[PDB]
Amino acid sequence: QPSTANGGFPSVVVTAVTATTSISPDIESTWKGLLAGESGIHALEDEFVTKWDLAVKIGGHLKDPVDSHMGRLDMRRMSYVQRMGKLLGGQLWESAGSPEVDPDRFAVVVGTGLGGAERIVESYDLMNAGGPRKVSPLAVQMIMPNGAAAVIGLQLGARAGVMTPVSAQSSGSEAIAHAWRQIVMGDADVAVCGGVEGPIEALPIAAFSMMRAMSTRNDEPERASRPFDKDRDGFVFGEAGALMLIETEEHAKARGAKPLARLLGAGITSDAFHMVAPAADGVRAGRAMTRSLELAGLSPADIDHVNAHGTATPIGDAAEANAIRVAGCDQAAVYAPKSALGHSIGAVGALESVLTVLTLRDGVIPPTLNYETPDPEIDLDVVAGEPRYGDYRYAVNNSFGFGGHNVALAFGRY
Amino acid sequence: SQPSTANGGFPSVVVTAVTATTSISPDIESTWKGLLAGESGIHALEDEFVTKWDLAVKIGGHLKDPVDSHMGRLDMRRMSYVQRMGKLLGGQLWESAGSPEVDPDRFAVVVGTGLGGAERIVESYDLMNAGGPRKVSPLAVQMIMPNGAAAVIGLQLGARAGVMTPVSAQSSGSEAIAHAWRQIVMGDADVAVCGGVEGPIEALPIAAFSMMRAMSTRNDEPERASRPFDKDRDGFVFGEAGALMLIETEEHAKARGAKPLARLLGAGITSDAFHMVAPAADGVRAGRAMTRSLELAGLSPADIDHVNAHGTATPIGDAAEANAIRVAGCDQAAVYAPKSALGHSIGAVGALESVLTVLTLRDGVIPPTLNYETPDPEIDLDVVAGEPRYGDYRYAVNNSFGFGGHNVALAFGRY
Ligand SMILES: CCCCCCCCCCCCCCCC(=O)O[C@H](COC(=O)CCCCCCCC[C@H](C)CCCCCCCC)COP(=O)(O)O
Ligand SMILES: CCCCCCCCCCCCCCCC(=O)O[C@H](COC(=O)CCCCCCCC[C@H](C)CCCCCCCC)COP(=O)(O)O
Ligand SMILES: [K+]
Ligand SMILES: [K+]
Ligand code: NA
């Protein structure tokens, strides 16, 4: 059976990363911030919070709003996720040295949780007020959930496929998994991949709040997101979007690109357990991590580091601890970045994949914020307090989505 | 030499069961008979919303048998429409397959859709605007999320080897079958339910596509309106559908005694990077999606006896696809455009047309393309028309293209 280690798949490397977060618009600054213990989570000051008296009054808006970079035409003729895709795809391409690739070997794979949904409600209101001829001629292309990937594919010139996998909170990781598949199956030599997501707004907060999934520690915003802590009380929104450039090691060498890490293998499984709760036993989630190892050609004993999905729900973190045990990965050093950056839904697995890469590049794991009282059910080596330095070689990034979706990505130091 | 189905580098994958609901029939076998008899599912729309809004489009095909006549009280309150359609088709498919006892850890679901449970977005929005955040359902997130129908089916049927939802607008239903074939041939699953679901004809969808000037407005003769490849075409017509198939390795089928209907041999996915909604005129990357499906199957273009065209009956789309079929070397295939009779079901349609391609191979017959009356010289294809065309069809390609520049081609063969 082919694996990356045995040469049955070609070697695939990560050659550039870009992200915008609640800490910074610059991924390198976000990273320095994380290592210094910074949080992106603050009191929400939006008028919508008081207008509705929302139960949730905390979150991390982007440090640098996407629309501060957008012309007036884009603000009207693109949905928000498309604008985010255009901004991040252009940034990534510049970071990569604007390479001249063969468009016919270049794919784009970008996940998102929903798509241009503000344009659904806009079109509905316009039609209700004015009739069907008031709906924009650009409404379909702004709404369709493949819209952001399609904008990026047209902008950068990708003709080897433009794919949008949707798996709710695992979408951003799933996108990188399918990009890796598209390269190792021989359909592309280079891909832009990752995830984008909309901003914090009143209706998204109402819907998730009514699920009772969210922290309401509004008193102390930076202390609210507590993955694996005994006193955790649910997740916190933190806006983001993230893309990375991956390509065959061959392709990278031929253009002189310096790899940041290796993308070794990807596992996708599902729970068949519940529409929003993850299976308590962690078994299928663990098998996603095992599958990524099998395709990489690694054993769980090789794994140095897990970047946890770690949302800070009581049931979600308990299930993930079980998953990491099922996969034999519970001796590894664990980081839960949502402690600092909060949860960006369809973007978050992509953001956390970029963080995994930077851990491997720099030999360091940031502290998991708010990790103060260990939970006996969890029993994981959670990095906390100070950043932890080490010669990390191999890491798994976990992401799980409502609907029972498990995605694990195996990364290696270059 | 690289793996193909023909050289055994990929395992053999067979289609073992199919289910669809359409404007002609809730029964796929009765849909197929109807198509062969020249039936159309397109009629005048009778909905109050047409006259409320004075819509410029007044034709389309609603399902013959509405999904919600089969839904219980709780289903109507806990699922979006595409999830209800997914639960209904998933149970029908499983029964049609003999309710097999498969290993859940080797069983995947891959179901595409164009949008998701979007009616629950506008419902939630209205509820909150009237009554505040506490009026939003605690089920709103799971009903809205576009992976929702695939997740309902995966939970219903017990699939633990992955549940995926590729979105590529009007190619989503074919792209789902492509990713299901990949999940099997990469070794992640031995059996998969896959296809596509989509919402019903409603005013707001009509309004949005008719503002693109994309739709036929031949209201006085509804069965004559959808005219793919015809000189006098004037845009697409909505026809509701949902469709799923069961695929599995040949070994898995044989061990449980399943009778295959056809083989699924390979899949190509490319993109145009040309325009956000118009397909590239030159058909080059769409042709490459067909060629790639042939490479992975281990076929040559001369092997392809039949192409089931995406054929939406837009002036631009049909011309690009004819070019693409020529680029792929497949323009001596017999061509069927089923949207002529069933209309366009957006995220479902590639899956429905994949089911029809399987049936053409199983039965050795292509239905007539309806309304094909005046050949267009920029098209130059062998379009089946008038009576069905019979033959021992050995291999076929199904095409589907989506706004955003997405091209998907699926190669199938006779079992
Ligand atoms: C990290 C947060 C993640 C949230 C993810 C939630 C899903 C994201 C959906 C995209 C949101 C885009 C919002 C951008 C528009 C914007 O900014 O416009 C505001 C005005 O508000 C609006 O238009 C509200 C728009 C509401 C749109 C419908 C949202 C429906 C949400 C569902 C009921 C709940 C979430 C479903 C998630 C399912 C997928 C993942 C499991 C300023 O406008 P102005 O007056 O200053 O010009
Ligand atoms: C073959 C047609 C394909 C259409 C494809 C459109 C794609 C989206 C389909 C989703 C539609 C689901 C509707 C089912 C619910 C239902 O039936 O609710 C009616 C009442 O109306 C409504 O709630 C209408 C609410 C509409 C929801 C928003 C739709 C937004 C459409 C966009 C502006 C335009 C299309 C975007 C497509 C992008 C993806 C593909 C390129 C029963 O009324 P009652 O029982 O309450 O009396
Ligand atoms: K993670
Ligand atoms: K077709
Ligand atoms: Na006849």
Side-chain angles (χ1 to χ4, degrees):
Chain A
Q1 319 259 39
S3 73
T4 299
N6 76 9
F9 296 124
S11 172
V12 172
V13 288
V14 176
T15 53
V17 294
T18 183
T20 183
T21 72
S22 58
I23 293 179
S24 183
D26 177 335
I27 185 62
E28 300 291 340
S29 287
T30 289
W31 183 232
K32 282 191 263 298
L34 290 175
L35 292 173
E38 297 175 12
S39 174
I41 301 316
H42 306 113
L44 298 177
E45 249 121 42
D46 309 74
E47 228 202 298
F48 62 69
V49 174
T50 61
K51 169 183 158 97
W52 302 110
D53 190 26
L54 302 175
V56 172
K57 305 189 192 297
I58 54 173
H61 288 300
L62 296 178
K63 178 65 185 185
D64 177 29
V66 169
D67 290 349
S68 64
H69 289 96
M70 289 288 135
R72 302 277 201 79
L73 263 191
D74 286 339
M75 296 292 303
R76 288 175 228 207
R77 296 189 181 195
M78 287 195 169
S79 59
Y80 175 86
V81 287
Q82 287 172 326
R83 297 197 298 276
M84 176 177 279
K86 167 173 177 162
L87 177 70
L88 298 179
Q91 283 174 0
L92 184 66
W93 207 249
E94 193 159 318
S95 277
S98 313
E100 273 180 318
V101 301
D102 180 347
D104 294 343
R105 303 290 302 168
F106 174 24
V108 161
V109 187
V110 183
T112 192
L114 188 50
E118 78 283 11
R119 303 300 198 195
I120 294 171
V121 302
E122 195 185 28
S123 298
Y124 175 72
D125 283 341
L126 282 167
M127 174 171 184
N128 293 341
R133 296 187 84 250
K134 294 297 197 323
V135 170
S136 174
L138 305 200
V140 178
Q141 67 192 262
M142 292 190 289
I143 285 165
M144 65 190 190
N146 52 306
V151 158
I152 291 165
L154 182 55
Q155 184 174 148
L156 300 181
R159 292 186 167 152
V162 172
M163 294 183 296
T164 302
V166 296
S167 52
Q169 297 93 331
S170 54
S171 305
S173 280
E174 200 182 339
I176 297 173
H178 287 292
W180 177 79
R181 294 176 176 204
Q182 183 87 338
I183 291 174
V184 304
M185 287 193 83
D187 292 79
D189 296 330
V190 51
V192 166
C193 47
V196 295
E197 192 51 83
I200 296 165
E201 248 297 334
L203 181 55
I205 290 170
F208 282 94
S209 282
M210 289 303 287
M211 286 186 60
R212 318 184 110 164
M214 296 188 81
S215 181
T216 53
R217 192 171 306 228
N218 296 138
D219 41 292
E220 292 177 296
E222 281 180 27
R223 303 189 67 190
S225 182
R226 312 179 71 78
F228 306 117
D229 184 77
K230 185 166 188 208
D231 296 319
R232 61 192 186 276
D233 80 317
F235 80 91
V236 171
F237 280 139
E239 289 173 20
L243 297 174
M244 58 172 56
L245 183 62
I246 62 172
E247 55 200 277
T248 67
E249 183 167 358
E250 181 163 26
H251 186 281
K253 177 166 173 187
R255 69 187 189 87
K258 175 50 133 86
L260 310 171
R262 301 168 180 280
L263 172 54
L264 309 174
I268 298 173
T269 66
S270 54
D271 284 352
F273 171 80
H274 194 274
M275 289 297 292
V276 303
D281 66 12
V283 169
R284 297 309 299 168
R287 175 71 195 139
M289 300 181 77
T290 300
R291 178 61 168 165
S292 78
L293 304 190
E294 287 180 3
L295 290 171
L298 293 169
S299 299
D302 298 337
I303 301 309
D304 299 316
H305 170 58
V306 175
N307 185 300
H309 184 59
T311 66
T313 60
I315 58 176
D317 293 357
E320 183 169 22
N322 280 342
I324 295 170
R325 281 189 278 285
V326 159
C329 287
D330 53 310
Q331 310 299 310
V334 176
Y335 172 46
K338 292 184 181 58
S339 65
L341 287 165
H343 201 330
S344 48
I345 313 302
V348 79
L351 169 64
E352 294 173 352
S353 298
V354 165
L355 300 177
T356 302
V357 160
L358 299 180
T359 284
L360 293 167
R361 192 192 65 195
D362 289 351
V364 66
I365 302 170
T368 305
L369 300 187
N370 300 321
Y371 184 72
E372 289 165 359
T373 309
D375 180 336
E377 303 200 345
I378 297 298
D379 195 20
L380 289 179
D381 175 20
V382 179
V383 182
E386 290 295 316
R388 188 184 304 171
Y389 293 85
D391 192 358
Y392 308 115
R393 296 163 345 284
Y394 297 115
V396 180
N397 175 46
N398 284 357
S399 194
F400 309 113
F402 292 178
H405 316 288
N406 307 308
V407 180
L409 299 173
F411 286 94
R413 178 181 78 222
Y414 176 59
Chain B
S1 64
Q2 286 145 274
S4 67
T5 298
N7 75 16
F10 297 126
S12 170
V13 174
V14 287
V15 179
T16 48
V18 295
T19 189
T21 184
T22 69
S23 56
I24 294 174
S25 188
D27 180 341
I28 182 58
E29 294 296 333
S30 289
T31 288
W32 184 235
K33 285 183 182 84
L35 289 169
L36 290 169
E39 290 166 23
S40 168
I42 310 307
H43 309 306
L45 295 178
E46 296 193 46
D47 309 77
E48 215 357 83
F49 65 66
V50 177
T51 63
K52 174 187 174 48
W53 300 111
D54 199 11
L55 295 175
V57 173
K58 312 188 186 284
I59 49 170
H62 290 295
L63 295 184
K64 180 59 59 158
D65 178 24
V67 162
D68 287 351
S69 69
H70 291 97
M71 291 292 129
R73 294 184 179 204
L74 293 174
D75 295 318
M76 293 302 303
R77 302 226 155 169
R78 294 183 179 181
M79 286 187 274
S80 61
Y81 179 85
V82 292
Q83 292 174 310
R84 297 191 304 264
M85 172 179 284
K87 171 175 178 170
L88 174 63
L89 293 180
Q92 280 174 358
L93 181 69
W94 210 246
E95 164 155 6
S96 279
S99 299
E101 276 183 306
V102 302
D103 176 354
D105 298 336
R106 299 299 295 163
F107 171 29
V109 165
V110 184
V111 173
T113 194
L115 186 57
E119 79 282 12
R120 296 300 189 161
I121 294 168
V122 308
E123 190 187 31
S124 295
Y125 178 68
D126 284 340
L127 280 169
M128 177 171 179
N129 297 336
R134 292 203 54 84
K135 297 307 185 198
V136 177
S137 171
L139 299 182
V141 174
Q142 71 192 71
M143 294 192 292
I144 288 171
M145 65 192 186
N147 50 310
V152 160
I153 296 162
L155 180 55
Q156 170 191 219
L157 305 179
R160 296 187 164 153
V163 170
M164 301 186 282
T165 300
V167 173
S168 55
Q170 297 92 337
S171 52
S172 302
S174 277
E175 195 180 342
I177 295 172
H179 287 293
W181 174 84
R182 295 175 177 203
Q183 188 82 339
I184 294 178
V185 299
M186 283 192 92
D188 295 73
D190 299 324
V191 52
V193 161
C194 50
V197 291
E198 188 57 78
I201 300 169
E202 255 287 344
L204 182 53
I206 285 169
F209 285 91
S210 71
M211 288 304 296
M212 301 187 63
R213 278 92 179 180
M215 295 188 77
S216 177
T217 61
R218 192 182 303 243
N219 297 141
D220 301 321
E221 295 173 296
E223 298 189 13
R224 305 190 63 190
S226 180
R227 318 180 59 89
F229 303 118
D230 182 81
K231 179 99 149 165
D232 293 324
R233 57 193 187 274
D234 76 326
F236 75 92
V237 175
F238 280 140
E240 291 173 19
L244 299 176
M245 51 172 63
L246 181 65
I247 59 175
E248 61 196 272
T249 69
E250 188 161 8
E251 181 177 354
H252 185 273
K254 163 196 160 65
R256 82 187 179 86
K259 219 212 130 99
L261 285 72
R263 300 174 182 283
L264 171 57
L265 303 171
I269 294 175
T270 65
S271 50
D272 285 351
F274 173 73
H275 195 270
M276 286 296 295
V277 300
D282 68 9
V284 168
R285 295 310 296 164
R288 173 73 189 139
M290 305 180 73
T291 300
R292 180 58 171 164
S293 71
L294 301 190
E295 295 178 354
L296 293 173
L299 300 171
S300 67
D303 287 333
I304 298 310
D305 292 317
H306 171 50
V307 170
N308 180 305
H310 182 61
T312 65
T314 62
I316 299 286
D318 289 2
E321 181 167 18
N323 272 346
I325 291 167
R326 272 184 276 293
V327 165
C330 290
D331 51 311
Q332 304 317 142
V335 174
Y336 175 39
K339 296 180 181 56
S340 63
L342 290 164
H344 201 326
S345 46
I346 312 300
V349 78
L352 169 66
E353 295 177 348
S354 298
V355 169
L356 297 178
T357 299
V358 162
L359 292 188
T360 276
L361 291 160
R362 187 192 68 195
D363 287 353
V365 65
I366 303 167
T369 301
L370 299 192
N371 300 317
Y372 187 71
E373 285 166 4
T374 312
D376 183 330
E378 302 184 7
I379 301 299
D380 211 14
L381 292 175
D382 174 27
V383 179
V384 172
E387 289 296 329
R389 176 101 53 94
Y390 290 86
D392 182 38
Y393 304 111
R394 299 160 311 125
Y395 300 100
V397 175
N398 178 45
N399 285 349
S400 291
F401 307 116
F403 289 181
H406 309 293
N407 306 310
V408 181
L410 295 175
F412 289 97
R414 230 202 155 248
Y415 183 74

